[PDB]
Each structure stands twice: as C-alpha cells, then as structure tokens.
Amino acid sequence: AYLHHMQKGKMIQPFGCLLALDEKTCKVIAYSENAPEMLTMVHPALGIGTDIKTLFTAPSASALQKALGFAEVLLLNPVLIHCKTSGKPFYAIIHRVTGSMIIDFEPVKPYEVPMTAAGALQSYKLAAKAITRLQSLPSGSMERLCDTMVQEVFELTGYDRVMAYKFHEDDHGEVIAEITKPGLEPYLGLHYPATDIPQASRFLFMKNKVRMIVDCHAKHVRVLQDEKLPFDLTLCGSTLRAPHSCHAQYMANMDSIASLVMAVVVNDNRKRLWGLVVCHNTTPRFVPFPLRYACEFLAQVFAIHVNKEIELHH
Amino acid sequence: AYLHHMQKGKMIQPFGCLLALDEKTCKVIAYSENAPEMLTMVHPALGIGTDIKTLFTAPSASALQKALGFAEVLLLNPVLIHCKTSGKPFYAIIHRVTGSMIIDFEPVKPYEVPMTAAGALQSYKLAAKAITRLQSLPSGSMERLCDTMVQEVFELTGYDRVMAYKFHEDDHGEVIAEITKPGLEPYLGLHYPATDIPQASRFLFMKNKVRMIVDCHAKHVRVLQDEKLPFDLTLCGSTLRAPHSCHAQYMANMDSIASLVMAVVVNDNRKRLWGLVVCHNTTPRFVPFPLRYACEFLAQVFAIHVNKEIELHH
Numbered sequence: 001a002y003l004h005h006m007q008k009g010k011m012i013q014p015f016g017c018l019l020a021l022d023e024k025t026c027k028v029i030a031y032s033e034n035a036p037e038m039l040t041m042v043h044p045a046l047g048i049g050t051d052i053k054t055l056f057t058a059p060s061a062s063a064l065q066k067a068l069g070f071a072e073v074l075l076l077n078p079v080l081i082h083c084k085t086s087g088k089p090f091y092a093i094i095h096r097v098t099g100s101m102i103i104d105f106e107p108v109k110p111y112e113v114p115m116t117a118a119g120a121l122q123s124y125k126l127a128a129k130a131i132t133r134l135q136s137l138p139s140g141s142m143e144r145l146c147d148t149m150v151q152e153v154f155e156l157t158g159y160d161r162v163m164a165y166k167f168h169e170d171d172h173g174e175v176i177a178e179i180t181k182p183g184l185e186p187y188l189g190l191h192y193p194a195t196d197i198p199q200a201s202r203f204l205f206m207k208n209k210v211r212m213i214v215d216c217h218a219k220h221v222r223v224l225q226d227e228k229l230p231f232d233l234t235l236c237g238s239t240l241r242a243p244h245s246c247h248a249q250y251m252a253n254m255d256s257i258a259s260l261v262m263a264v265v266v267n268d269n270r271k272r273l274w275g276l277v278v279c280h281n282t283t284p285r286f287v288p289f290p291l292r293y294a295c296e297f298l299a300q301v302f303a304i305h306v307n308k309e310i311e312l313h314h
Numbered sequence: 315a316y317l318h319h320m321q322k323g324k325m326i327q328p329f330g331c332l333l334a335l336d337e338k339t340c341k342v343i344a345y346s347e348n349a350p351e352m353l354t355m356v357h358p359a360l361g362i363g364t365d366i367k368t369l370f371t372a373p374s375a376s377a378l379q380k381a382l383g384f385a386e387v388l389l390l391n392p393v394l395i396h397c398k399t400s401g402k403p404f405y406a407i408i409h410r411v412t413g414s415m416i417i418d419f420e421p422v423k424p425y426e427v428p429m430t431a432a433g434a435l436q437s438y439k440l441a442a443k444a445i446t447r448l449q450s451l452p453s454g455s456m457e458r459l460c461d462t463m464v465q466e467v468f469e470l471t472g473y474d475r476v477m478a479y480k481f482h483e484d485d486h487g488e489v490i491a492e493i494t495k496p497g498l499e500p501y502l503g504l505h506y507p508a509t510d511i512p513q514a515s516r517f518l519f520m521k522n523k524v525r526m527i528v529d530c531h532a533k534h535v536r537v538l539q540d541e542k543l544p545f546d547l548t549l550c551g552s553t554l555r556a557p558h559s560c561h562a563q564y565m566a567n568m569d570s571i572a573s574l575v576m577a578v579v580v581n582d583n584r585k586r587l588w589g590l591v592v593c594h595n596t597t598p599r600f601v602p603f604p605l606r607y608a609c610e611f612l613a614q615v616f617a618i619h620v621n622k623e624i625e626l627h628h
C-alpha cells in the first residue's frame with residue numbers, strides 16, 4: 001500500500017508547484033492544482049495541453065524544451081525561469097521518467113536572481129570546505145566521523161537539530177551522533193523500531209538522496225493528470241512530494257515541523273542504505289535547491305568515509 | 315619599470331569591459347574605452363559621472379548598489395547583470411581598491427542565462443570531485459600528486475596543455491608535470507631562467523591567484539579615469555588586466571595564444587609562491603568566472619597537499 005501511493009506521488013507540498021511534460025510534444029500532461037496561481041495571472045489557462053511558451057519567457061521556455069534532449073544523469077539543475085506575464089522567478093528542478101519530463105518549481109526572491117551563480121558557488125564552497133575537514137579527520141573512529149558530519153551539516157543548513165541515524169541489521173535505527181541548538185531534548189543513543197521508517201521509504205532513499213519537508217502542517221496540493229493516460233504517472237522523484245499522513249503526524253507529534261533528510265548509501269554507483277543524516281526544525285524551514293545539491297555531495301563523501309571506517313573495523 | 319606598468323598600467327583585454335565606481339556616490343569614475351559599445355546601444359550614455367541606474371536593469375543595479383556596502387572578503391561573485399532595455403547579460407566580478415569599487419564585466423550568451431546557477435554548481439562539483447581524488451592519494455610522492463593535479467586541471471579547463479611549474483630556491487622554474495592533447499610537443503622537464511617571470515609578477519600571484527589571457531594577439535583597450543580623481547586607479551586586481559607587451563610577445567613566440575595560470579601558495583593566509591599551474595591553448599580560449607573560481611579552490615587544496623609533501627620528505 002505504501003509504495004503504490006508514494007510512487008504515484010499525487011500530493012505535493014504547497015511551497016512549490018509541479019508540471020509534467022510529454023517529451024514528444026513538450027505540452028503539459030500533469031500539473032499541481034496550485035500551478036495556475038503560481039505560474040500565471042489567471043487568454044488561455046494552464047491545463048492539460050498547455051504549451052510552455054505561453055507560461056514562461058522565451059529563454060526560459062527554451063531552456064526547459066532543450067532539457068528534453070539530455071539523459072537524466074546529464075541534466076544540470078536547477079534552471080532559473082521567469083514567468084511570462086508576471087516575470088516572477090522560480091528554480092525549475094528537472095527529472096525524467098521515461099517519456100515524461102517532470103519539473104518542480106520553487107520560488108526565488110527577486111534579489112536572489114542576480115546572485116544565483118554567486119549563491120550557488122558559495123553553497124558548494126562551504127560544502128567543499130566541510131569535505132576537506134571530513135578528510136582531515138584521523139581514521140579509526142566512526143563516532144568522531146559522524147560527530148564531525150552532523151556538526152558540518154548543522155552549520156551548513158541552519159536546522160535546529162541534526163542527527164546521524166544508523167540502520168542496524170534488523171532494519172531498526174539508532175541515533176549515533178547529534179547536535180542541537182541549546183535547550184532541545186536529545187535523542188542521541190536512542191533506538192527506534194524498523195517500522196518507523198518503512199521499507200518503501202528506505203527504498204526511495206536509494207534513488208532520491210535528499211528529501212525536504214518545509215512544514216508538516218501545510219495543506220497538500222493535488223496533482224491532476226491527462227485523463228487520456230491509462231496509467232498513473234510516477235511523481236515520487238519530485239522535490240515537492242508530500243509526506244504520507246502517518247509521517248506528517250509523527251513529525252507534528254515530536255515538534256519537528258520541518259525536516260531535511262540525506263541518504264547515506266555505502267558502495268554507491270554491496271550497495272546499501274547505511275543510514276540517514278536527519279535535520280529537523282521546530283518551525284517551518286525552506287532551503288533552496290543549490291544548497292540541497294551541495295548537501296547531496298557532502299553526503300556522498302561522508303558515505304565513502306563511513307564505508308572506509310566499516311572496513312577498517314572489519 | 316615592471317611594477318609601474320603593472321600597478322599603473324591602464325590597459326585591459328577586449329573580451330570584457332570595466333567600470334570603476336566611487337565608493338560613496340556609486341557613480342562612474344573610470345571606464346574602459348569599449349564599455350560604451352559593450353554596455354549601451356549608443357551627453358553620452360556612458361562616461362565619467364554616469365549613474366549605474368541608467369545602465370542596468372533594477373535587480374542588476376540594486377545588486378551592485380548593495381555590493382558598494384560589503385567588505386571585499388564578504389563579496390560573493392559573480393553578479394549576473396543585465397543592461398537596460400536590451401537585457402544584454404554579463405557576469406560582474408567586483409573587487410575593491412582604496413577609493414573605488416571596480417567591476418569587471420564578462421559577457422554571457424543570452425540563452426545561457428537560465429543555466430547560470432546550474433553551470434556554477436557543475437563547475438564546483440567537478441572541482442570538488444577532483445579535490446577528493448587529490449585527497450585519496452597515498453602520500454609520499456610529489457610526482458604522483460603533481461601528475462594528478464595537472465590531469466584534473468586539464469579535464470576541468472579544456473586547455474591544450476597543462477603544466478606544473480615549480481620555483482627553485484634561486485627563483486628559476488622547472489616544468490615538473492605536464493599533460494597535453496595528443497600530438498603536442500612536450501615541455502616536461504625544462505628549466506627556465508628566473509627572469510622569465512619577474513618578481514613583480516611573482517608577487518602579484520600572491521594576491522591575484524588566477525590569471526586568464528584569452529588571446530595574446532588581441533588589441534588592448536585603455537581605461538580612462540577622471541584626471542581629478544584624487545588617486546590613481548590600479549588594475550592589478552582586474553580579471554581583464556592586459557598582459558605586458560613583453561609577455562604577449564613571449565606567448566605568441568611559443569604558440570600559447572591563450573593561458574590560464576593558477577598560483578600555488580604554500581602556508582597561505584613561511585608563505586611562499588611554490589609554483590604555478592600553467593594552462594596554455596594554441597587558439598584563443600575563454601572560460602567563465604565560476605570555473606575560474608572553482609579552480610582557485612582546487613589550487614588552494616593542491617597547495618596544502620604540496621606543503622604536506624614537503625614537510626614529509628624533510
């Protein structure tokens with residue numbers, strides 16, 4: 001049941017909006033219900049069949065159309081687009097599922113637009129400096145390694161709590177490293193049942209390496225697809241995918257209103273989800289795609305060092 | 315002689331243009347002679363006293379006005395700027411000197427503007443992956459380290475030739491590592507007199523860590539300043555500074571039409587120019603600022619690893 005509903009990904013978070021385009025026509029075959037309000041100023045309305053040249057400025061529309069010609073692995077994200085009518089800017093984060101191109105749109109502040117390259121370099125520079133400090137660490141201690149990683153992620157991301165959450169051989173988890181703002185209740189050293197993080201969630205982390213939830217109380221937005229399609233599209237690769245209601249309740253229950261989670265995959269391309277780097281915030285929190293992208297590489301390097309320490313232990 | 319037409323030389327390369335703005339009024343106090351044609355469509359539109367609000371779109375001018383408020387170590391470069399009406403885009407690379415904020419403008423292809431952050435992330439990602447390969451090197455071999463560095467820089471920058479050029483105690487240089495495209499004659503192993511790289515040039519590299527020359531045969535452009543400006547505007551810090559005619563001729567004579575040079579400073583803040591990573595191309599070559607910025611960090615990491623190797627076999 002979990003996997004069915006998570007793969008389809010028909011509910012999104014309202015911080016952004018989603019379009020899916022047919023690779024052959026470049027026209028809209030799915031949209032989140034908030035996309036008309038976000039991307040247009042409601043003389044044709046955004047719906048099934050819409051041409052993106054009516055939605056975005058010419059260079060923006062062209063950048064999205066040109067993306068159709070890249071293999072997933074060669075897509076360079078994000079694209080900064082401007083809406084045609086309003087001029088409103090968004091980062092467009094593109095992924096592919098077979099013959100569909102799925103696009104997440106996350107708003108950008110106006111003053112961020114001239115600074116887009118600057119901010120991207122700075123985010124990656126900070127992450128690269130973290131990586132050099134991971135590398136500097138004396139080997140032999142998983143604990144020092146994980147302590148360092150949670151400290152670096154805390155400084156980079158500005159969340160109230162950062163944990164290293166390790167999966168044991170029976171799939172139960174343990175918090176093995178933690179940093180928090182002063183005053184928060186610690187979870188360090190605590191163990192949690194396997195069923196707190198279902199198989200389906202662990203499976204998706206193998207492919208979707210960074211997952212952000214801005215506000216667990218936010219009202220989810222439905223995605224509508226072309227009625228002509230005789231199957232459901234798979235939208236689980238979206239950056240905006242809404243949390244399952246069980247998990248949103250779980251978050252509300254522990255006063256983690258926002259989260260950012262990074263998969264830690266050892267022997268990645270023996271390939272195994274070692275654990276998660278789990279960031280929580282007491283209040284809503286959004287971090288822009290370039291920083292999340294930089295975090296993904298920091299987590300990849302961490303995973304290499306984790307596996308080194310495992311082998312040094314064995 | 316040398317230092318006083320490198321500190322007081324007023325020529326730039328024509329691949330971009332330069333403005334200097336007053337540190338209080340923000341108005342133009344100096345400009346390259348090609349800036350009117352490059353930035354306007356032609357009481358001139360650009361001269362001494364021009365207000366940048368008349369040259370650039372509002373987010374663009376806004377972002378530059380904001381920079382006029384930040385300390386230089388706090389400047390995050392580059393800024394993506396658009397010229398008024400045309401939207402003609404440039405990367406603006408900002409630095410400070412006594413009395414002024416100096417802005418180098420390097421053109422950007424208009425349809426690439428949506429991909430500026432994407433390109434910046436990819437440049438830094440590639441450099442960060444190179445850094446991890448330098449890091450994974452078994453220590454004990456300066457040769458392996460330098461060979462790996464030139465290889466990484468070659469793949470990142472796309473130049474015909476990449477060399478590691480080491481300064482001996484007597485300041486003469488030696489090519490100690492090299493990679494080229496197939497069929498180029500090597501320079502590996504050659505020693506060159508100290509006078510080929512004058513002390514003033516070596517001293518500049520301490521501060522200006524990356525230097526690009528797009529075309530040694532290009533016709534240089536004068537920077538004009540108000541003759542009543544109470545100080546002399548230096549171009550030592552400009553990305554566009556023209557090569558001394560002696561060096562331009564040296565490049566032509568060895569068929570290096572283009573170059574990209576990275577300083578390698580050990581004990582950086584004992585502090586010494588160890589050498590240079592020297593990239594040459596047979597034909598003109600331009601790489602954008604975000605890649606040069608990424609290369610700067612790669613060179614900094616390289617310098618640390620060089621200095622470790624020195625201490626090790628000492």
Ligand SMILES: *[C@H](C)[C@H]1/C(=C/c2[nH]c(/C=C3N=C(/C=C4\NC(=O)C(CC)=C4C)C(C)=C\3CCC(=O)O)c(CCC(=O)O)c2C)NC(=O)[C@@H]1C
Nearest residue numbers: 187192195196197198201211242243244246247250259261
């Ligand atoms: C519903 C009946 C059951 C359930 C389902 C469920 N959990 C997840 C995913 C996650 N659960 C956790 C758990 C933790 N977070 C913490 O901070 C800690 C230590 C304090 C634990 C143990 C995490 C980190 C995730 C991943 C969530 C994310 O992606 O950020 C899912 C998947 C939700 C989704 O939409 O992806 C589901 C369905 N959880 C329960 O507790 C019930 C038994």
Ligand SMILES: *[C@H](C)[C@H]1/C(=C/c2[nH]c(/C=C3N=C(/C=C4\NC(=O)C(CC)=C4C)C(C)=C\3CCC(=O)O)c(CCC(=O)O)c2C)NC(=O)[C@@H]1C
Nearest residue numbers: 506509510511512515525556557558560561564573575592
């Ligand atoms: C002029 C009478 C004399 C002189 C002056 C001069 N040289 C430079 C700068 C550089 N010279 C070199 C030399 C080399 N490049 C190589 O690739 C090799 C090995 C094949 C050598 C020996 C280099 C690398 C530089 C740095 C240049 C850069 O910034 O890219 C200058 C400074 C030029 C400037 O405007 O900054 C000057 C004035 N060179 C001679 O040969 C004369 C004897």
